[PDB]
Amino acid sequence: KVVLATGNVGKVRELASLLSDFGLDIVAQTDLGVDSAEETGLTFIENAILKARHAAKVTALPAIADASGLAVDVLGGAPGIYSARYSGEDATDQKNLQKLLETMKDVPDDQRQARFHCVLVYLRHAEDPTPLVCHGSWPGVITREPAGTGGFGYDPIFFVPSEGKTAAELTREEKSAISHRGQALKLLLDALR
Amino acid sequence: MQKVVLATGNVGKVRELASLLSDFGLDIVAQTDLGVDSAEETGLTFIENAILKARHAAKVTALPAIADASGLAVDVLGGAPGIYSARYSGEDATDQKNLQKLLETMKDVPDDQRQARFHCVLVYLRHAEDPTPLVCHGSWPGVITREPAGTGGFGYDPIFFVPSEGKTAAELTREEKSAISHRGQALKLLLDALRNG
Ligand SMILES: O=P(O)(O)OP(=O)(O)OP(=O)(O)OC[C@H]1O[C@@H](n2cnc3c(O)ncnc32)[C@H](O)[C@@H]1O
Ligand SMILES: O=P(O)(O)OP(=O)(O)OP(=O)(O)OC[C@H]1O[C@@H](n2cnc3c(O)ncnc32)[C@H](O)[C@@H]1O
Ligand SMILES: [Ca+2]
Ligand SMILES: [Ca+2]
Ligand code: NA
Ligand code: NA
Ligand code: NA
Ligand code: NA
Ligand code: NA
Protein backbone atom coordinates (compact mmCIF):
# COMPACT_ATOMS: atom_id res chain seq x y z
CA LYS A 1 0.00 0.00 0.00
CA VAL A 2 1.33 3.45 -1.05
CA VAL A 3 -0.21 6.90 -0.54
CA LEU A 4 -0.33 9.22 -3.51
CA ALA A 5 0.56 12.53 -1.82
CA THR A 6 -1.12 14.99 -4.23
CA GLY A 7 -4.42 16.85 -4.36
CA ASN A 8 -4.04 17.42 -8.10
CA VAL A 9 -6.52 15.30 -10.04
CA GLY A 10 -4.58 15.84 -13.29
CA LYS A 11 -1.48 14.40 -11.60
CA VAL A 12 -3.53 11.51 -10.17
CA ARG A 13 -4.82 10.62 -13.67
CA GLU A 14 -1.27 10.52 -14.99
CA LEU A 15 0.18 8.48 -12.13
CA ALA A 16 -2.27 6.23 -10.35
CA SER A 17 -2.97 3.58 -13.04
CA LEU A 18 0.69 3.28 -14.17
CA LEU A 19 1.74 2.80 -10.54
CA SER A 20 -1.06 0.19 -10.14
CA ASP A 21 0.02 -1.62 -13.34
CA PHE A 22 3.49 -1.81 -11.77
CA GLY A 23 1.85 -3.64 -8.84
CA LEU A 24 1.30 -1.02 -6.13
CA ASP A 25 -1.94 -0.51 -4.19
CA ILE A 26 -2.39 3.25 -4.62
CA VAL A 27 -4.54 5.40 -2.30
CA ALA A 28 -5.13 9.13 -2.93
CA GLN A 29 -4.11 11.07 0.21
CA THR A 30 -7.56 12.76 0.43
CA ASP A 31 -9.25 9.34 0.90
CA LEU A 32 -7.07 9.08 4.03
CA GLY A 33 -7.90 12.56 5.42
CA VAL A 34 -4.47 14.02 4.58
CA ASP A 35 -4.67 17.78 4.10
CA SER A 36 -2.33 19.86 1.93
CA ALA A 37 1.26 20.10 3.17
CA GLU A 38 2.83 23.53 3.66
CA GLU A 39 4.99 24.00 0.55
CA THR A 40 7.76 26.02 2.12
CA GLY A 41 10.60 24.69 -0.06
CA LEU A 42 12.69 26.66 -2.54
CA THR A 43 13.18 23.77 -4.98
CA PHE A 44 11.06 21.13 -6.60
CA ILE A 45 13.04 18.44 -4.76
CA GLU A 46 12.43 19.92 -1.31
CA ASN A 47 8.72 20.41 -1.94
CA ALA A 48 8.25 16.88 -3.29
CA ILE A 49 9.96 15.48 -0.16
CA LEU A 50 7.81 17.68 2.12
CA LYS A 51 4.57 16.54 0.53
CA ALA A 52 5.55 12.85 0.61
CA ARG A 53 6.75 13.22 4.20
CA HIS A 54 3.51 14.94 5.31
CA ALA A 55 1.44 12.04 3.89
CA ALA A 56 3.74 9.36 5.31
CA LYS A 57 3.49 11.01 8.75
CA VAL A 58 -0.33 11.07 8.74
CA THR A 59 -0.91 7.61 7.26
CA ALA A 60 2.10 5.48 8.26
CA LEU A 61 2.30 4.31 4.62
CA PRO A 62 5.09 4.79 2.09
CA ALA A 63 4.33 7.86 -0.03
CA ILE A 64 4.86 9.16 -3.54
CA ALA A 65 4.71 12.93 -4.27
CA ASP A 66 5.18 15.10 -7.35
CA ALA A 67 6.54 18.66 -7.37
CA SER A 68 6.43 20.14 -10.85
CA GLY A 69 6.09 23.36 -12.78
CA LEU A 70 6.78 25.29 -15.98
CA ALA A 71 10.00 27.25 -16.55
CA VAL A 72 9.90 29.84 -19.36
CA ASP A 73 13.31 31.03 -20.62
CA VAL A 74 12.37 34.65 -21.42
CA LEU A 75 10.95 34.93 -17.85
CA GLY A 76 14.19 33.65 -16.32
CA GLY A 77 12.59 30.33 -15.44
CA ALA A 78 9.32 31.69 -14.05
CA PRO A 79 6.78 30.72 -12.96
CA GLY A 80 8.86 27.67 -11.91
CA ILE A 81 8.17 26.49 -8.37
CA TYR A 82 5.44 29.18 -8.22
CA SER A 83 3.60 27.69 -11.20
CA ALA A 84 0.49 26.68 -9.23
CA ARG A 85 -0.07 30.18 -7.79
CA TYR A 86 1.18 32.17 -10.76
CA SER A 87 -2.01 34.31 -10.95
CA GLY A 88 -2.48 34.53 -7.13
CA GLU A 89 -4.55 32.39 -4.78
CA ASP A 90 -7.56 32.97 -6.91
CA ALA A 91 -5.47 30.78 -9.24
CA THR A 92 -7.04 28.18 -11.54
CA ASP A 93 -5.34 26.40 -14.46
CA GLN A 94 -7.14 28.73 -16.91
CA LYS A 95 -6.32 31.93 -14.99
CA ASN A 96 -2.66 30.83 -14.76
CA LEU A 97 -2.25 30.03 -18.46
CA GLN A 98 -4.10 33.21 -19.48
CA LYS A 99 -1.82 35.29 -17.25
CA LEU A 100 1.08 33.64 -18.98
CA LEU A 101 -0.27 34.41 -22.41
CA GLU A 102 -0.78 38.05 -21.37
CA THR A 103 2.77 38.21 -19.90
CA MET A 104 4.33 36.87 -23.11
CA LYS A 105 2.20 38.75 -25.67
CA ASP A 106 5.18 40.85 -26.90
CA VAL A 107 7.74 38.00 -26.80
CA PRO A 108 8.91 37.13 -30.37
CA ASP A 109 7.76 33.75 -31.76
CA ASP A 110 11.32 32.48 -31.69
CA GLN A 111 11.96 33.31 -28.01
CA ARG A 112 9.14 31.30 -26.39
CA GLN A 113 11.17 28.25 -25.26
CA ALA A 114 10.02 26.57 -22.02
CA ARG A 115 10.54 23.39 -20.05
CA PHE A 116 8.36 21.45 -17.66
CA HIS A 117 10.16 20.01 -14.61
CA CYS A 118 9.02 17.11 -12.44
CA VAL A 119 10.54 15.64 -9.31
CA LEU A 120 8.93 12.41 -8.06
CA VAL A 121 9.82 11.14 -4.59
CA TYR A 122 9.20 7.78 -2.97
CA LEU A 123 9.57 7.67 0.80
CA ARG A 124 9.60 4.28 2.53
CA HIS A 125 8.63 6.00 5.79
CA ALA A 126 8.39 9.66 6.84
CA GLU A 127 12.02 9.75 8.01
CA ASP A 128 13.55 7.60 5.27
CA PRO A 129 17.06 9.19 5.09
CA THR A 130 17.52 8.03 1.47
CA PRO A 131 14.28 8.66 -0.40
CA LEU A 132 14.13 7.69 -4.05
CA VAL A 133 14.20 11.04 -5.85
CA CYS A 134 13.75 10.98 -9.65
CA HIS A 135 13.41 13.85 -12.00
CA GLY A 136 12.38 14.54 -15.54
CA SER A 137 12.15 17.57 -17.75
CA TRP A 138 10.43 18.20 -21.08
CA PRO A 139 11.24 21.06 -23.45
CA GLY A 140 8.59 22.74 -25.56
CA VAL A 141 7.47 26.14 -26.82
CA ILE A 142 4.76 28.43 -25.45
CA THR A 143 2.01 28.98 -28.04
CA ARG A 144 0.16 32.27 -28.49
CA GLU A 145 -3.27 30.64 -28.18
CA PRO A 146 -4.49 27.51 -26.36
CA ALA A 147 -5.11 24.32 -28.35
CA GLY A 148 -6.34 20.93 -27.18
CA THR A 149 -8.56 19.89 -24.27
CA GLY A 150 -6.55 17.06 -22.62
CA GLY A 151 -4.17 17.12 -19.64
CA PHE A 152 -4.25 19.99 -17.18
CA GLY A 153 -2.41 23.11 -16.07
CA TYR A 154 -0.48 24.85 -18.82
CA ASP A 155 -0.88 21.93 -21.29
CA PRO A 156 -2.98 23.89 -23.84
CA ILE A 157 -0.18 26.42 -24.39
CA PHE A 158 2.80 24.03 -24.41
CA PHE A 159 3.79 22.99 -27.93
CA VAL A 160 5.66 19.70 -28.01
CA PRO A 161 8.03 19.71 -31.01
CA SER A 162 8.51 15.90 -31.21
CA GLU A 163 4.72 15.52 -31.53
CA GLY A 164 3.92 18.62 -33.62
CA LYS A 165 1.06 19.54 -31.26
CA THR A 166 0.46 20.83 -27.75
CA ALA A 167 0.50 18.71 -24.61
CA ALA A 168 -3.29 19.14 -24.34
CA GLU A 169 -3.65 17.77 -27.89
CA LEU A 170 -1.96 14.49 -26.94
CA THR A 171 -3.81 11.44 -25.73
CA ARG A 172 -3.12 10.58 -22.08
CA GLU A 173 -1.00 7.60 -23.23
CA GLU A 174 1.11 9.75 -25.59
CA LYS A 175 1.68 12.37 -22.90
CA SER A 176 2.51 9.71 -20.31
CA ALA A 177 5.10 8.22 -22.72
CA ILE A 178 7.18 11.41 -23.02
CA SER A 179 6.33 14.07 -20.44
CA HIS A 180 8.56 15.37 -17.61
CA ARG A 181 6.31 13.26 -15.35
CA GLY A 182 6.46 10.07 -17.51
CA GLN A 183 10.26 10.33 -17.71
CA ALA A 184 10.55 10.73 -13.92
CA LEU A 185 8.10 7.87 -13.39
CA LYS A 186 10.06 5.52 -15.62
CA LEU A 187 13.14 6.29 -13.51
CA LEU A 188 11.19 5.78 -10.29
CA LEU A 189 9.79 2.40 -11.39
CA ASP A 190 13.31 1.30 -12.53
CA ALA A 191 14.64 2.24 -9.08
CA LEU A 192 11.77 0.43 -7.30
CA ARG A 193 12.49 -2.80 -9.22
CA MET B 1 37.79 34.50 -12.44
CA GLN B 2 34.47 33.03 -11.11
CA LYS B 3 34.87 31.05 -7.86
CA VAL B 4 32.75 28.10 -6.60
CA VAL B 5 32.53 27.68 -2.82
CA LEU B 6 33.06 24.14 -1.50
CA ALA B 7 30.52 24.16 1.33
CA THR B 8 32.21 21.74 3.74
CA GLY B 9 34.47 22.11 6.77
CA ASN B 10 35.62 18.48 6.42
CA VAL B 11 39.25 18.38 5.23
CA GLY B 12 38.89 14.70 4.38
CA LYS B 13 36.04 15.54 1.96
CA VAL B 14 38.00 18.52 0.49
CA ARG B 15 40.89 16.16 -0.31
CA GLU B 16 38.54 13.86 -2.14
CA LEU B 17 36.63 16.57 -4.12
CA ALA B 18 38.86 19.55 -4.88
CA SER B 19 41.27 18.11 -7.41
CA LEU B 20 38.65 16.70 -9.86
CA LEU B 21 36.56 19.87 -9.55
CA SER B 22 39.75 21.81 -10.42
CA ASP B 23 40.50 19.47 -13.37
CA PHE B 24 36.96 20.12 -14.65
CA GLY B 25 37.81 23.85 -14.71
CA LEU B 26 36.24 25.18 -11.50
CA ASP B 27 38.04 27.70 -9.29
CA ILE B 28 37.25 26.16 -5.90
CA VAL B 29 37.41 27.95 -2.53
CA ALA B 30 36.87 26.16 0.79
CA GLN B 31 34.05 27.88 2.68
CA THR B 32 36.32 28.51 5.77
CA ASP B 33 38.62 30.69 3.60
CA LEU B 34 35.58 32.90 3.02
CA GLY B 35 34.75 32.87 6.75
CA VAL B 36 31.64 30.66 6.36
CA ASP B 37 30.47 29.01 9.53
CA SER B 38 28.88 25.55 9.58
CA ALA B 39 25.17 25.59 8.61
CA GLU B 40 22.61 24.07 10.97
CA GLU B 41 21.92 20.55 9.62
CA THR B 42 18.23 20.21 10.49
CA GLY B 43 17.35 17.96 7.56
CA LEU B 44 16.12 14.43 7.88
CA THR B 45 17.80 13.20 4.69
CA PHE B 46 21.26 13.45 3.19
CA ILE B 47 19.67 15.24 0.22
CA GLU B 48 17.99 17.93 2.34
CA ASN B 49 21.14 18.47 4.41
CA ALA B 50 23.36 18.77 1.28
CA ILE B 51 20.95 21.39 -0.12
CA LEU B 52 20.87 23.35 3.16
CA LYS B 53 24.68 23.41 3.39
CA ALA B 54 25.07 24.47 -0.25
CA ARG B 55 22.41 27.15 0.21
CA HIS B 56 23.98 28.59 3.42
CA ALA B 57 27.37 28.99 1.70
CA ALA B 58 25.78 30.40 -1.47
CA LYS B 59 23.79 32.92 0.57
CA VAL B 60 26.80 34.07 2.68
CA THR B 61 29.25 34.29 -0.22
CA ALA B 62 27.10 35.08 -3.29
CA LEU B 63 29.02 32.33 -5.18
CA PRO B 64 27.75 29.00 -6.66
CA ALA B 65 28.20 26.30 -4.03
CA ILE B 66 28.83 22.57 -3.84
CA ALA B 67 28.04 20.58 -0.67
CA ASP B 68 28.38 16.96 0.38
CA ALA B 69 26.14 15.19 2.90
CA SER B 70 27.28 11.70 3.61
CA GLY B 71 27.30 8.97 6.21
CA LEU B 72 27.57 5.29 7.17
CA ALA B 73 24.39 3.19 7.41
CA VAL B 74 24.80 -0.14 9.32
CA ASP B 75 22.08 -2.78 8.58
CA VAL B 76 21.89 -4.41 12.04
CA LEU B 77 21.53 -0.90 13.55
CA GLY B 78 18.57 -0.10 11.30
CA GLY B 79 20.74 2.29 9.29
CA ALA B 80 22.48 4.14 12.11
CA PRO B 81 24.55 6.23 12.49
CA GLY B 82 23.20 7.41 9.09
CA ILE B 83 22.56 11.16 8.82
CA TYR B 84 23.93 11.34 12.40
CA SER B 85 27.30 9.87 11.37
CA ALA B 86 29.38 12.99 12.24
CA ARG B 87 27.98 13.31 15.77
CA TYR B 88 27.65 9.59 16.54
CA SER B 89 29.77 9.74 19.75
CA GLY B 90 28.25 13.07 20.72
CA GLU B 91 29.32 16.65 21.25
CA ASP B 92 33.06 15.76 21.60
CA ALA B 93 33.07 13.54 18.45
CA THR B 94 36.23 12.90 16.42
CA ASP B 95 36.68 10.29 13.67
CA GLN B 96 38.45 7.92 16.07
CA LYS B 97 35.84 8.37 18.88
CA ASN B 98 33.02 7.75 16.37
CA LEU B 99 34.56 4.59 14.91
CA GLN B 100 35.51 3.22 18.36
CA LYS B 101 31.95 3.77 19.57
CA LEU B 102 30.76 1.82 16.61
CA LEU B 103 33.17 -0.98 17.29
CA GLU B 104 31.94 -1.14 20.89
CA THR B 105 28.30 -1.00 19.76
CA MET B 106 28.80 -3.89 17.33
CA LYS B 107 30.93 -6.08 19.67
CA ASP B 108 28.42 -8.95 19.83
CA VAL B 109 27.13 -8.71 16.24
CA PRO B 110 27.88 -11.98 14.34
CA ASP B 111 30.19 -11.89 11.31
CA ASP B 112 27.38 -12.44 8.80
CA GLN B 113 25.36 -9.49 10.19
CA ARG B 114 27.96 -6.70 9.84
CA GLN B 115 26.80 -5.32 6.44
CA ALA B 116 26.88 -1.56 5.85
CA ARG B 117 26.81 1.07 3.16
CA PHE B 118 28.30 4.56 2.77
CA HIS B 119 25.98 7.15 1.17
CA CYS B 120 26.98 10.42 -0.51
CA VAL B 121 24.77 13.21 -1.89
CA LEU B 122 26.50 16.09 -3.72
CA VAL B 123 24.62 19.19 -4.67
CA TYR B 124 25.49 22.16 -6.88
CA LEU B 125 23.56 25.43 -6.44
CA ARG B 126 24.06 28.36 -8.86
CA HIS B 127 22.48 30.78 -6.35
CA ALA B 128 20.98 30.30 -2.85
CA GLU B 129 17.47 30.11 -4.36
CA ASP B 130 18.25 27.96 -7.45
CA PRO B 131 14.98 25.96 -7.93
CA THR B 132 16.71 23.11 -9.80
CA PRO B 133 20.01 22.36 -8.09
CA LEU B 134 22.12 19.55 -9.53
CA VAL B 135 21.77 16.64 -7.09
CA CYS B 136 23.85 13.48 -7.49
CA HIS B 137 24.28 10.49 -5.23
CA GLY B 138 26.45 7.40 -4.81
CA SER B 139 26.48 4.48 -2.38
CA TRP B 140 29.11 1.89 -1.55
CA PRO B 141 28.48 -1.41 0.31
CA GLY B 142 30.96 -3.12 2.63
CA VAL B 143 31.25 -4.88 5.96
CA ILE B 144 32.18 -3.48 9.40
CA THR B 145 35.45 -4.93 10.73
CA ARG B 146 36.13 -5.80 14.36
CA GLU B 147 39.37 -3.80 14.53
CA PRO B 148 40.62 -0.76 12.61
CA ALA B 149 43.00 -1.38 9.73
CA GLY B 150 44.73 1.15 7.47
CA THR B 151 45.59 4.83 7.86
CA GLY B 152 44.26 6.38 4.65
CA GLY B 153 41.05 8.37 4.16
CA PHE B 154 39.02 9.65 7.09
CA GLY B 155 35.99 9.02 9.26
CA TYR B 156 34.94 5.37 9.48
CA ASP B 157 37.32 4.22 6.67
CA PRO B 158 39.53 2.08 8.99
CA ILE B 159 36.58 -0.13 9.93
CA PHE B 160 34.86 -0.37 6.55
CA PHE B 161 35.93 -3.56 4.77
CA VAL B 162 35.35 -3.58 1.02
CA PRO B 163 34.83 -7.20 -0.16
CA SER B 164 35.68 -6.34 -3.80
CA GLU B 165 39.11 -5.10 -2.73
CA GLY B 166 39.83 -7.55 0.15
CA LYS B 167 40.81 -4.58 2.40
CA THR B 168 39.30 -1.64 4.31
CA ALA B 169 38.61 1.79 2.85
CA ALA B 170 41.62 3.11 4.85
CA GLU B 171 43.91 0.47 3.28
CA LEU B 172 43.09 1.77 -0.18
CA THR B 173 45.24 4.36 -1.94
CA ARG B 174 43.60 7.75 -2.53
CA GLU B 175 43.32 6.75 -6.20
CA GLU B 176 41.72 3.34 -5.48
CA LYS B 177 39.20 4.88 -3.09
CA SER B 178 38.20 7.64 -5.55
CA ALA B 179 37.58 5.04 -8.25
CA ILE B 180 34.91 3.14 -6.34
CA SER B 181 33.64 5.08 -3.31
CA HIS B 182 30.18 6.55 -2.72
CA ARG B 183 31.84 9.98 -3.19
CA GLY B 184 33.82 9.14 -6.41
CA GLN B 185 30.61 7.84 -7.96
CA ALA B 186 28.58 10.91 -6.94
CA LEU B 187 31.34 13.33 -7.98
CA LYS B 188 31.66 11.96 -11.55
CA LEU B 189 27.90 12.15 -11.89
CA LEU B 190 28.02 15.75 -10.67
CA LEU B 191 30.79 16.61 -13.16
CA ASP B 192 28.70 15.03 -15.94
CA ALA B 193 25.63 17.06 -14.83
CA LEU B 194 27.72 20.26 -14.66
CA ARG B 195 29.09 19.83 -18.20
CA ASN B 196 25.69 19.01 -19.68
CA GLY B 197 23.93 21.73 -17.72
O1 LIG C 1 1.08 19.96 -4.61
P1 LIG C 1 0.15 19.01 -5.27
O2 LIG C 1 -1.05 18.61 -4.45
O3 LIG C 1 0.75 17.79 -5.92
O4 LIG C 1 -0.63 19.82 -6.45
P2 LIG C 1 -0.29 21.23 -7.15
O5 LIG C 1 -1.03 21.21 -8.45
O6 LIG C 1 -0.45 22.35 -6.21
O7 LIG C 1 1.22 20.90 -7.51
P3 LIG C 1 2.53 21.79 -7.54
O8 LIG C 1 2.76 22.75 -6.44
O9 LIG C 1 3.53 20.74 -7.89
O10 LIG C 1 2.13 22.69 -8.80
C1 LIG C 1 2.64 22.61 -10.13
C2 LIG C 1 2.08 23.16 -11.21
O11 LIG C 1 2.79 23.01 -12.44
C3 LIG C 1 1.83 22.80 -13.43
N1 LIG C 1 2.06 21.50 -14.03
C4 LIG C 1 2.69 20.46 -13.45
N2 LIG C 1 2.68 19.44 -14.32
C5 LIG C 1 2.01 19.85 -15.43
C6 LIG C 1 1.67 19.25 -16.64
O12 LIG C 1 2.01 17.98 -16.89
N3 LIG C 1 1.01 19.96 -17.58
C7 LIG C 1 0.67 21.22 -17.36
N4 LIG C 1 0.96 21.83 -16.19
C8 LIG C 1 1.64 21.16 -15.24
C9 LIG C 1 0.50 22.68 -12.64
O13 LIG C 1 -0.63 23.01 -13.46
C10 LIG C 1 0.69 23.62 -11.45
O14 LIG C 1 0.57 24.94 -11.99
O1 LIG D 1 28.89 18.91 6.99
P1 LIG D 1 30.31 19.06 6.51
O2 LIG D 1 30.95 20.40 6.73
O3 LIG D 1 30.45 18.64 5.06
O4 LIG D 1 31.23 18.07 7.37
P2 LIG D 1 30.82 16.81 8.26
O5 LIG D 1 32.03 15.95 8.42
O6 LIG D 1 30.03 17.20 9.48
O7 LIG D 1 29.82 16.08 7.26
P3 LIG D 1 28.44 15.26 7.39
O8 LIG D 1 27.43 15.84 8.35
O9 LIG D 1 28.12 15.03 5.94
O10 LIG D 1 29.03 13.99 8.11
C1 LIG D 1 29.27 12.70 7.58
C2 LIG D 1 30.08 11.78 8.11
O11 LIG D 1 30.07 10.52 7.45
C3 LIG D 1 31.40 10.05 7.54
N1 LIG D 1 31.87 9.87 6.17
C4 LIG D 1 31.42 10.54 5.09
N2 LIG D 1 32.13 10.11 4.02
C5 LIG D 1 33.01 9.17 4.47
C6 LIG D 1 34.02 8.38 3.89
O12 LIG D 1 34.33 8.43 2.57
N3 LIG D 1 34.71 7.53 4.65
C7 LIG D 1 34.51 7.41 5.98
N4 LIG D 1 33.59 8.15 6.57
C8 LIG D 1 32.84 9.04 5.83
C9 LIG D 1 32.18 11.25 8.12
O13 LIG D 1 33.44 10.83 8.73
C10 LIG D 1 31.18 11.89 9.09
O14 LIG D 1 31.06 10.98 10.20
CA1 LIG E 1 1.16 22.55 -4.51
CA1 LIG F 1 27.94 18.10 9.15
NA1 NA G 1 -1.83 25.88 -13.11
NA1 NA H 1 -2.92 22.33 -11.86
NA1 NA I 1 26.28 13.60 10.05
NA1 NA J 1 34.75 13.13 9.42
NA1 NA K 1 36.32 9.01 -2.44
Swiss-Prot record, chain A:
The reported effect of N8A is:
Greatly reduced ITP pyrophosphatase activity
- Residues that coordinate or bind substrate: T6, G7, N8, V9, G10, K11, S68, F152, G153, Y154, D155, K175, H180, R181
Q: What is the lineage of its organism?
A: Bacteria, Pseudomonadati, Pseudomonadota, Gammaproteobacteria, Enterobacterales
User: What are its GO cellular component terms?
Assistant: cytoplasm; cytosol
Give, from the UniProt record, the effect of changing T6A: Greatly reduced ITP pyrophosphatase activity
The name this protein carries in UniProt is: dITP/XTP pyrophosphatase
**Which sites are catalytic?**
A67 (proton acceptor)
Result of knocking out the encoding gene:
Inactivation of this gene in a moa background (cells deficient in molybdopterin biosynthesis) results in increased N-6-hydroxylaminopurine (HAP) sensitivity, an increase in the level of mutagenesis, and increased recombination and SOS induction upon HAP exposure. A double deletion with priB is disadvantageous to cells.
Instruction: Give the organism the record lists.
Output: Escherichia coli (strain K12)
Q: Function of this protein? A: Pyrophosphatase that catalyzes the hydrolysis of nucleoside triphosphates to their monophosphate derivatives, with a high preference for the non-canonical purine nucleotides XTP (xanthosine triphosphate), dITP (deoxyinosine triphosphate) and ITP. Can also efficiently hydrolyze 2'-deoxy-N-6-hydroxylaminopurine triphosphate (dHAPTP). Seems to function as a house-cleaning enzyme that removes non-canonical purine nucleotides from the nucleotide pool, thus preventing their incorporation into DNA/RNA and avoiding chromosomal lesions. Genetic interactions among priB, dam, lexA, nagC, polA, rdgB, rdgB, rep and uup link the PriA-PriB replication restart pathway to DNA double-strand break repair.
Q: Which family does it belong to?
A: Belongs to the HAM1 NTPase family.
Enzyme Commission numbers on file: 3.6.1.66
